[PDB]
Design a protein around this ligand. Structure first.
Ligand SMILES: [Mg+2]
Ligand SMILES: [Zn+2]
Length: 363
């Protein structure tokens, strides 16, 4: 990023970014080693949660945030819409593509959960909703490659209704069912993709008309997730949980995009907290979370999963935490929706709307 920030130079930079990203892959082994230790992977993909939202709600000190072993502080969601965010996470094992290329085929080895299934992990798909709104489940299947049947939702308590009137299931009940389904799946190892949207602004209680209280809803969700973590620790089960918000809820707006709007994938909307917690270790992590400050995105999640595949971390007495958390792949914070791109160039944000000229994102 030495050339002057003209439209031609920024377009050239972005196209070079795509070309460099296309050469990046998170490489999985052909088989697990003979002494591999089984564990469960659970990826919790959450709608409408960014660092900016947590600060706006006054919840930066909720115990959940210190209940991780690794925390990414500059993770970029690369989009501000749910469907694209889920596709990008499901395609975590290859470098970042343009928005248009999310809807074109990718190499089979780009699909994180297929890479895990090929190594003997049972794949599970679980949702706190039915995925009909916005064609979300359809995109997860067609572009995210996720063909697993939806985990049974029958008899789960319903906390709210979504904007379209369909159920929003209670996260505590969903997660407790996950414990049971994984116990009963005949496999010692599994990988689950869980998408949940309790903070979505259109969720409501039928007949009430009260405006949603984001802080109260976020407090309840964080309380439920933290309680699930505490119970999972006491269970002795070997689990890797990755908490990955899709994108922010846009609680705080700015000069160019007012609060609530997500058409432009602004830095505050795409800068999301990503946390990893390990359960059932012989030597559980003791301090505050290890912080990864470098610019990161989904490729770093895939590479961390590769590093843990053999399960040795769960039986090691002296874990080299630095080895585990160092040298992960870095990714520039480029974000796209269908007709908007945001980049950082010479430490300043720029935006391109409708394929026109680049303009500074006003600050
Ligand atoms: Mg099992
Ligand atoms: Zn979403």
């Amino acid at each position: 990023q030495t050339a002057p920030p003209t439209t031609a130079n920024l377009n050239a930079w972005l196209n070079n970014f795509y070309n460099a990203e296309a050469k990046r892959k998170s490489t999985f082994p052909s088989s697990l080693p003979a002494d591999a230790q089984p564990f469960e992977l659970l990826v919790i993909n959450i709608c409408s949660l960014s660092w900016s939202d947590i600060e706006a709600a006054g919840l930066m000190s909720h115990p959940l945030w210190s209940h991780f072993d690794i925390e990414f502080k500059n993770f970029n969601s690369a989009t501000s819409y749910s469907g694209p965010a889920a596709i990008r996470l499901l395609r975590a094992s290859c470098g970042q593509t343009s928005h248009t290329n999310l809807y074109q085929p990718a190499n089979n080895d780009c699909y994180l959960f297929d890479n895990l299934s090929k190594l003997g992990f049972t794949q599970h798909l679980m949702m706190g909703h039915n995925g009909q709104f916005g064609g979300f489940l359809k995109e997860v299947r067609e572009n995210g490659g996720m063909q697993s049947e939806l985990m049974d939702q029958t008899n789960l308590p319903v906390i709210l209704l979504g904007f379209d009137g369909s159920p929003v299931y209670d996260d505590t009940a969903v997660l407790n069912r996950w414990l049971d389904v994984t116990e009963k799946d005949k496999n010692s190892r599994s990988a689950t993709f869980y998408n949940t949207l309790p903070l979505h602004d259109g969720n409501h209680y039928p007949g009430v008309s009260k405006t949603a209280d984001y802080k109260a809803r976020a407090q309840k969700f964080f309380d439920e997730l933290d309680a699930f973590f505490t119970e999972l620790e006491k269970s002795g089960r070997k689990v890797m949980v990755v908490v990955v918000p899709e994108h922010g809820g846009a609680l705080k707006g700015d000069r160019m995009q007012v609060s609530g709007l997500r058409d432009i994938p602004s830095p505050s909307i795409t800068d999301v907290p990503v946390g990893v917690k390990f359960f059932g270790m012989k030597a559980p992590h003791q301090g505050a979370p290890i912080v990864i400050e470098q610019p990161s995105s989904f490729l770093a999640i895939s590479d961390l999963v590769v590093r843990v595949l053999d399960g040795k971390i769960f039986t090691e007495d002296n874990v080299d935490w630095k080895k585990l958390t160092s040298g992960l792949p870095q990714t520039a914070p480029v974000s796209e929706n269908s007709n908007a791109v945001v980049i950082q160039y010479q430490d300043k944000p720029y935006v391109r709307l409708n394929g026109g000229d680049w303009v500074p994102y006003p600050q």
